[PDB]
C-alpha cells in the first residue's frame, strides 16, 4: 500500500475556511520530499521537522485539513499568529508540529463575476481554540440589545463572502491550503 495524497489535493471542489475539512490518514509511508516537487507550491513550510527527513519517519496519527483563504491571509495559517482568520476561522496551536501547503487557484475558484461559494466568519466574541471548527450561522449580537435572530442594526450575519474576481491583486486572490498535522 501507499498513502493517498491525490484525494485531498487534486479534489475538484474545495471547502470554505470556517467549515474546513479534516481528512484522517491511517496508512504506510508517505512521499513528502515527493510533494515538495509533486507540483509548484507558492508556500511549503513545516513547523516541526526538516522536510527532507519526513520520509524517514512515521506517526501515531496524521490529519490533512483543507480550505480556501486569500493570499495575504495565507500567512495566518502558522503557529502563534493572530488575525481575522486565525482568531475566528482556523487556529493552529502554538506547539503545532507539521507542515503547511498552499498554492494559487485563481483559475479554479474565481469566476468573472466573482465566485461567492467561499465564505469566512467575520464576527465572533471569542477566539477559536486550536483545531476548532465553528459552523453556526447565528445572528451576531454587536449591541447591548439582543437580536433574536433578525438581521438589523448591531445584529449582523456572522459569515461574509469572498469576492473572487480574476481581476484581483495577488493578495485578494484565492489560495487553496492544506495543513498536515502530527
Amino acid at each position, epitope marked *: 500500500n501507499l498513502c493517498p495524497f491525490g484525494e485531498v489535493f487534486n479534489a475538484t471542489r474545495f471547502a470554505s475556511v470556517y467549515a474546513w475539512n479534516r481528512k484522517r490518514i491511517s496508512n504506510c509511508v508517505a512521499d513528502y520530499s515527493v510533494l515538495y516537487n509533486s507540483a509548484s507550491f507558492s508556500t511549503f513550510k513545516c513547523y516541526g521537522v526538516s522536510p527532507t527527513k519526513l520520509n524517514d519517519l512515521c506517526f501515531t496519527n496524521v490529519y490533512a485539513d483543507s480550505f480556501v483563504i486569500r493570499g495575504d491571509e495565507v500567512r495566518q495559517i502558522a503557529p502563534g499568529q493572530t488575525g*481575522k482568520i486565525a*482568531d*475566528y476561522n482556523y487556529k493552529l496551536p502554538d506547539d503545532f508540529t507539521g507542515c503547511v501547503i498552499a498554492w494559487n487557484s485563481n483559475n479554479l475558484d474565481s469566476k468573472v463575476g466573482g465566485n461567492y461559494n467561499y465564505l469566512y466568519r467575520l464576527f465572533r466574541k471569542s477566539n477559536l481554540k486550536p483545531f476548532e471548527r465553528d459552523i453556526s450561522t447565528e445572528i451576531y449580537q454587536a449591541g447591548s440589545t439582543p437580536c433574536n435572530g433578525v438581521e438589523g442594526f448591531n445584529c*449582523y450575519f456572522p459569515l461574509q463572502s469572498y*469576492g473572487f474576481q480574476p*481581476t484581483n491583486g*495577488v493578495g485578494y486572490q484565492p489560495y487553496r491550503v492544506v495543513v498536515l498535522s502530527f
Partner: antibody
Framework: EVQLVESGGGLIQPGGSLRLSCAASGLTVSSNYMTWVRQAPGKGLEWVSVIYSGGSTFYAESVKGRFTISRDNSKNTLYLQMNSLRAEDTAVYYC???????????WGQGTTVIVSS | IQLTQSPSFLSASVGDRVTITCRAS??????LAWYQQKPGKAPKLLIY???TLQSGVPSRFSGSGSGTEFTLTISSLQPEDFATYYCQQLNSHPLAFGPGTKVDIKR
C-alpha cells in the same frame, strides 16, 4: 443613543505620554472591531490602531511600541495609551466602530493632541 | 494597498452632477467605502461595498466601481454637500484611506 464620546486630548511635551478615552453608548466595544484614526493638520485620515472583539490588537508601523490600545468591558470604554510622543503625533484622534464589510458607521467627535515643548 | 483620488480639488456649483474617482494599487473587487468630512467634523460614512447606500444617506449619493477604479457620484449637488470626500479599503487590519477630494464652490 449611538455615540462615541472622546476625551483626554490636550497639550504634551515630546516624549511624554497621554491616554485617550472613547466612551461608547449604543454599541458594545468588547464585541466590536474598534479603531483609532488620526488626522494630522491639513492631512487626510490615517489608521493608528485596531482591536478585535476576541482581543487581537494591531498597530500602524509608525506607532508600534509607543501606542497601546485597550478596552474596559465594565465601563464600555476604548483606550489609546500614547507613549514616547512626538512632534509628528500632533493631530486630531478619531475613534470609530468598524463593521469590516459594512464600513465605519459610528465615529467619535474627535479629540486634539498637540505635542510641543 | 494604496488609494488615490483624481481631483485633489473639484469645482462645482449647486445643482451640478459631480464625480470623484478612487484608484486602487491592485485589485480589491468592490471592497470600498466612501466618507464625507466637513471641517472640524467627524467623517460620515456614505457608501459601503462600493455601491450600497449607507442608511440615512440622501439618495443623491451613488457608488460605482469594481476591481481597481471606483467613482462616487452626487447627481444634483446641494449646498449641504460641499465637503471633502475620502475613499477607504474595507478592512480590519491596515486601513487605506484615499488622499481626499475637496469639492469647491465654482467661480
Amino acid at each position: 443613543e449611538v455615540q462615541l464620546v472622546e476625551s483626554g486630548g490636550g497639550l504634551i511635551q515630546p516624549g511624554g505620554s497621554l491616554r485617550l478615552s472613547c466612551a461608547a453608548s449604543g454599541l458594545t466595544v468588547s464585541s466590536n472591531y474598534m479603531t483609532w484614526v488620526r488626522q494630522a493638520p491639513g492631512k487626510g485620515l490615517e489608521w493608528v490602531s485596531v482591536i478585535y472583539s476576541g482581543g487581537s490588537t494591531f498597530y500602524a508601523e509608525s506607532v508600534k511600541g509607543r501606542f497601546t490600545i485597550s478596552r474596559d468591558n465594565s465601563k464600555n470604554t476604548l483606550y489609546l495609551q500614547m507613549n514616547s510622543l512626538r512632534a509628528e503625533d500632533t493631530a486630531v484622534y478619531y475613534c470609530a466602530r468598524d463593521l469590516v464589510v459594512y464600513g465605519m458607521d459610528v465615529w467619535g467627535q474627535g479629540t486634539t493632541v498637540i505635542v510641543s515643548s | 494597498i494604496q488609494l488615490t483620488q483624481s481631483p485633489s480639488f473639484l469645482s462645482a456649483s449647486v445643482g451640478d452632477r459631480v464625480t470623484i474617482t478612487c484608484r486602487a494599487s491592485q485589485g480589491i473587487s468592490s471592497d470600498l467605502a466612501w466618507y464625507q468630512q466637513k471641517p472640524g467634523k467627524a467623517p460620515k460614512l456614505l457608501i459601503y461595498a462600493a455601491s450600497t447606500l449607507q442608511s440615512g444617506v440622501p439618495s443623491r449619493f451613488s457608488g460605482s466601481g469594481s476591481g481597481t477604479e471606483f467613482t462616487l457620484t452626487i447627481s444634483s449637488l446641494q449646498p449641504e454637500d460641499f465637503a471633502t470626500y475620502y475613499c477607504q479599503q474595507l478592512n480590519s487590519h491596515p486601513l487605506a484611506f484615499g488622499p481626499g477630494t475637496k469639492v469647491d464652490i465654482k467661480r
